[PDB]
């Protein structure tokens with residue numbers, strides 16, 4: 001397939017924020033931003049909007065929507081997504097300077113997991129935001145920080161789209177304000193109780209690590225884009241994203257890559273262990289259990305002896321905390337898609353806690369609400385076959401007047417109740433605080 005047409009645009013370090021600001025209020029407008037980060041994997045920023053097809057999954061049903069046709073289906077949501085992908089009959093050859101050339105882009109929420117495993121339904125469902133919300137885009141705006149170039153690509157009419165881009169305006173305000181203090185869904189004693197429940201479950205053998213999180217919430221008013229813009233500057237997280245959905249918006253400040261699939265080369269970098277702003281025997285041990293997880297997760301689809309562990313226990317300094325990351329690599333077989341892979345490993349072992357299903361069972365049992373978008377993934381499935389995805393840690397959900405932000409902490413035998421309590425706070429204190437002003 002006839003590669004897309006490309007127009008290079010004027011260069012500017014902030015082009016991503018610059019062009020996106022006139023799209024930010026549009027439903028299905030999405031920005032993947034590398035957080036202006038100093039990082040090996042912070043080369044690109046990508047913008048899309050105006051999809052030619054969208055997919056929305058709520059539970060058991062997926063709605064596939066185009067121009068002139070709307071269908072519903074109970075089939076597997078990633079199978080369905082891949083079928084939509086193949087019928088667009090668009091398949092450009094792979095290009096290291098354009099990792100997305102149109103294709104699927106969006107949100108894969110934590111509860112989407114429910115379509116891949118049978119799970120209990122204890123946690124309350126109190127957020128109405130889809131389990132899968134992704135657009136099919138025949139164009140993209142790509143900002144390359146390595147090469148310094150801004151490329152506008154279209155499989156359609158790339159003059160038409162520059163034209164359309166041009167004309168979009170950056171929209172009269174409305175100031176973001178938090179209208180309540182942050183409030184947790186747990187007291188210290190309720191956290192306390194479920195931390196011990198976790199440990200009795202670890203002591204009685206079901207699991208060996210379980211990620212337990214608390215959720216903070218508040219009322220707010222105003223537009224979320226400016227707030228994103230000040231959170232992004234302060235977090236400089238390499239896998240950040242701003243998603244304007246039909247239901248509300250997602251402000252991700254994630255520094256964590258889930259799965260990269262680049263020209264069939266697989267990379268996943270789970271984050272596990274932190275201290276506030278790396279010999280830490282308990283953490284560089286909590287991480288290894290997650291590394292083994294991933295090993296197993298990607299190796300269910302990977303090329304036979306392709307899984308390697310090129311990197312263990314590296315610390316990366318971030319605004320809020322010091323974190324520990326490991327890296328696992330592998331090769332996708334030429335007969336499968338990045339989407340089969342996503343499906344085999346979703347949701348991320350680093351935010352569930354091995355073994356994954358039993359770990360997800362406890363989470364549903366102890367967390368008072370479903371996680372919805374938090375700890376699910378955001379990313380793209382390009383028409384060229386590449387894939388990149390994050391773990392939506394450090395991520396808020398802004399919907400119907402309310403904004404949410406969760407915080408988790410991995411629990412193992414060696415974990416201590418008050419210190420783990422504090423870690424959940426450590427991870428998001430700069431984010432709750434900045435929003436308060």
Ligand SMILES: N[C@@H](Cc1c[nH]c2ccccc12)C(=O)O
Nearest residue numbers: 032033041042043044239240390
């Ligand atoms: N950091 C990625 C692009 C990116 C930014 N935010 C993201 C969120 C999800 C997936 C990818 C991204 C890169 O350089 O290629």
